[PDB]
C-alpha cells in the first residue's frame with residue numbers, strides 16, 4: 485500500500501514491457517520512458533479501481549460515470565513518479581490533475597467519443613490550472629512532445645488551446661495511443677496480480 489511498494493511493482497512491470505517496446509520503437513530513450521510511464525499508469529489504474537478491462541468495452545456514459553476514479557489514478561501516478569524519477573517534486577495536486585487528463589482522454593476516445601469532443605472534455609478537465617502550468621506539464625509528457633514539439637517553446641497554453649493542439653496532431657496521438665494500449669493492459673493485469681498477492 486505504501487507508495488514505495490507501488491513504485492517497486494511498477495519498476496518490475498516496466499522491465500517486462502521494455503524488451504517488447506524496443507522491438508518497435510527505434511528511439512530507445514523514448515522506449516525506456518514509455519515502459520516506465522505505461523507501467524506506472526497500469527499500477528495506478530489498478531490500485532485506484534479503474535476497471536480497465538471494462539473501459540475498453542464501455543459506452544461513453546459508462547466511462548463518464550468512472551471519471552472520479554481517473555482523478556484518483558492521476559494522484560497515484562504522480563506520487564509513484566516522484567519515487568521512480570524524482571522530478572515531479574512540486575504541486576502534486578496540480579500535476580495529478582494534468583496526468584489524470586491523459587488516461588481519461590484515452591478512455592473517452594476508446595469508448596467512441598469523437599476525437600474533437602473528447603479533446604474539449606480534456607479542456608474542461610484542466611480548468612483551474614494557469615496556462616503557464618498547463619504548458620509546463622505538457623512539456624513533461626514525451627508523447628505530447630513527440631507528436632507536437634512546438635510545446636517545447638510554448639510558455640502559455642490555455643485549456644482551449646491545449647484541446648486545439650490535440651486536434652491538430654490527432655493522427656500522431658492516435659498512433660502513440662494505439663502503440664501504448666496493449667502494454668497498458670498488460671501492465672494493469674500484472675499490477676492486479678502483484679497487488680493482490
Ligand code: HEM
Pocket residue numbers: 517518519520521522561562565569572579582583585586587589621622624625626627628657660661664
Ligand atoms: C497519447 C498517448 C500518451 C502516451 C503514450 C503518454 C505517455 C507518457 C509517458 C510514458 C509519461 C512518463 C514519462 C517518463 O516517465 O519519463 C507521461 C507523462 C505525462 N503525460 Fe503523457 N502520454 C500520452 C498522452 C497524454 C495526454 C493527452 C496528456 C494530457 C494531459 C498527458 C499528460 C502527461 C503528463 C502531465 C505527464 C507528466 C507525469 C508527471 O509529471 O508525473 N499524456 N506520458
